[PDB]
Structure formats: structure tokens, C-alpha cells
Design a binder for this molecule. Structure first.
Ligand SMILES: *[C@@H]1O[C@H](CO)[C@@H](O)[C@H](O)[C@H]1NC(C)=O
Ligand SMILES: [Ca+2]
Length: 276
């Protein structure tokens, strides 16, 4: 299967601590430097960012398969670019804090060399089982304080119910707000049964490769992007990509937690589909 585990760097999951003035759910630009924005372009050349993803090394982002096939492609446009190093999409340069500083680096928009959807994913399916895809970027990415790779779990590692994780993004889901500043929201992992309604179709079972997180005690935590990261902070403040958004959480009266692709469960597949 041509697995190349050594192409996933050991220097992963570390971010600069450079924190500052009054927050909210807003991040500083240095937080979660593996976030990516996925950009689309329709037939009259209108562009917009409508999905997220996570930088895993200097050549790849990992996202949901539903971000690279089907509905998004007809509703928004063709897959076009991936943006790294963004913080506030409303501004450029990005400047923050009472004692003011600016991000030295303009966000980078990279082309897509190839997209690899998981072979077992079915576009339009009720369950979206195996909702994962790799995007090989056009260029080797040089890491900075604002662009760095996230760690991936091993296939035998499990998140436990009650464990708190962080979903990060710009509200780029079907029902999201489309925020301009990158947001972080803390969410509990919950029993799979609580995601019964998440599919928006009855009778779908939550598989082992799916994670249910959000819910009744996390009504202030809706955000993230389709394909966007769900993170565990493990020992030594090293962040791991426990999940990516497959069905977004909804935080209203009759809403539901989100279903995430368990990324560790696809570690072998990832390693077999990356090249230097
Ligand atoms: C491209 O998107 C813009 C903005 O949403 C829209 O006005 C336009 O109709 C789209 N192009 C077509 C005709 O597909
Ligand atoms: Ca910006």
C-alpha cells in the first residue's frame, strides 16, 4: 500500500503561545496554525471559502470527502484553492491587541495538484461513512508561526465520552454563520445515541469510525467548518486531529451534536496516499 509514515512529521501539534488582549471565542492568529480554508470557484468565476481542512505535513491537507464532491460543487463551485495562514478574512494585514501587532505574513493560496477521496465513501449517502479526503497542494509549504502541521492519532487510540475537544473554524457548514475571525469552541464527546438526529435521516447507525460531540451541554459551541478540525490537546500542549466535521452540530432548541470522522481510524490509509 506504499505506506509512508515518515512523511508525517514528528514536529507536529505545536503552536506558539503568543497570547493577547480581550477575546470571546476569537483566536489569536498563532492559535491552531494547521487550519485551512477550502476555496471554490463557479462558472462565472465567483469564489468563496465554503469548507475547512487541516494541514498534516508540508504537502497535504485532510478534509471531509463531502468538501471535494457532490453538493458543495454544484451549490458553491468547483474546487479551486486552499488558504493557509489566515486569521481574519475581513482584513489584510491581520492586526490584534491593545498593544497592537500585525501578522507579518500574508495568507497563502495554494493550488490543488490532486484530490483523493476515500474509496469507500459514497457521494450523497445518508450516512456519509468514510467521509474523508486528502488534497495534495501545488507547492511544498514552508512552516511558520502561522502555518504548521497537526499531529494525527494512531488507529488504536480512543477518545472517551466526556472528553473535551476543541472545534475550530469559520462557521463554514450548511447552517453556520460564516464568521470572518477564526473561532475555537470547546465540546464534549458524547454517547453515539445522541447523534441519532444528526444525519437528518432516520435509522442511520453511528459507526466506529464516527465520533459524536457537542449536544445539550454545548449549545454555545456551534461552529467549525465542514471538513474542519476537532482537536485534543494531549500532553505538553501538543494538539492531535481526533476528528473532522462530517455532519455539523446544531445548537438550537431541537438540534443535535456533530458527527466527526475519526481521523486516527484512517491513519493507515493516509500514510498509503501521501508522497514526498
Ligand atoms: C456564481 O456565483 C455568484 C454569486 O453567488 C452568482 O451571482 C452567479 O450566478 C454564479 N454563477 C453561475 C451563473 O453559475
Ligand atoms: Ca486576513
Amino acid at each position: 500500500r506504499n505506506r509512508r509514515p515518515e512523511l508525517l512529521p514528528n514536529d507536529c501539534g505545536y503552536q506558539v503561545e503568543a497570547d493577547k488582549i480581550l477575546n470571546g471565542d476569537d483566536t489569536v492568529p498563532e492559535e491552531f496554525p494547521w487550519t485551512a480554508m477550502i476555496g471554490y470557484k463557479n462558472s462565472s468565476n465567483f469564489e468563496q471559502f465554503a469548507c475547512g481542512g487541516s494541514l498534516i505535513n508540508n504537502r497535504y491537507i485532510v478534509t471531509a470527502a463531502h468538501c471535494v464532491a457532490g453538493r458543495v460543487l454544484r451549490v458553491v463551485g468547483a474546487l479551486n484553492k486552499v488558504r493557509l495562514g489566515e486569521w481574519n478574512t475581513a482584513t489584510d494585514p491581520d492586526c490584534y491587541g491593545a498593544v497592537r501587532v500585525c501578522v507579518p505574513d500574508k495568507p497563502i493560496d495554494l493550488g490543488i495538484e490532486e484530490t483523493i477521496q476515500h474509496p469507500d465513501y459514497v457521494d450523497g449517502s445518508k450516512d456519509r461513512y468514510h467521509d474523508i479526503a486528502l488534497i495534495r497542494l501545488n507547492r511544498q509549504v514552508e512552516f511558520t508561526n502561522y502555518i504548521r502541521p497537526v499531529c494525527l492519532p494512531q488507529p488504536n487510540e480512543e477518545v472517551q465520552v466526556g472528553q473535551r475537544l476543541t472545534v475550530v473554524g469559520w462557521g463554514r457548514t450548511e447552517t453556520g454563520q460564516y464568521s470572518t475571525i477564526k473561532q475555537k469552541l470547546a465540546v464534549p464527546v458524547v454517547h453515539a445515541e445522541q447523534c441519532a438526529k444528526t444525519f437528518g435521516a432516520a435509522g442511520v447507525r453511528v459507526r466506529s469510525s464516527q465520533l459524536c460531540a457537542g449536544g445539550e451541554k454545548a449549545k454555545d459551541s456551534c461552529g467549525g467548518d465542514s471538513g474542519g478540525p476537532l482537536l485534543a490537546e494531549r500532553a505538553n500542549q501538543q494538539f492531535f486531529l481526533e476528528g473532522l466535521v462530517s455532519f455539523g452540530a446544531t445548537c438550537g432548541t431541537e438540534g443535535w451534536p456533530g458527527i466527526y470522522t475519526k481521523v486516527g481510524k484512517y491513519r493507515d490509509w493516509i500514510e498509503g496516499n501521501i508522497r514526498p
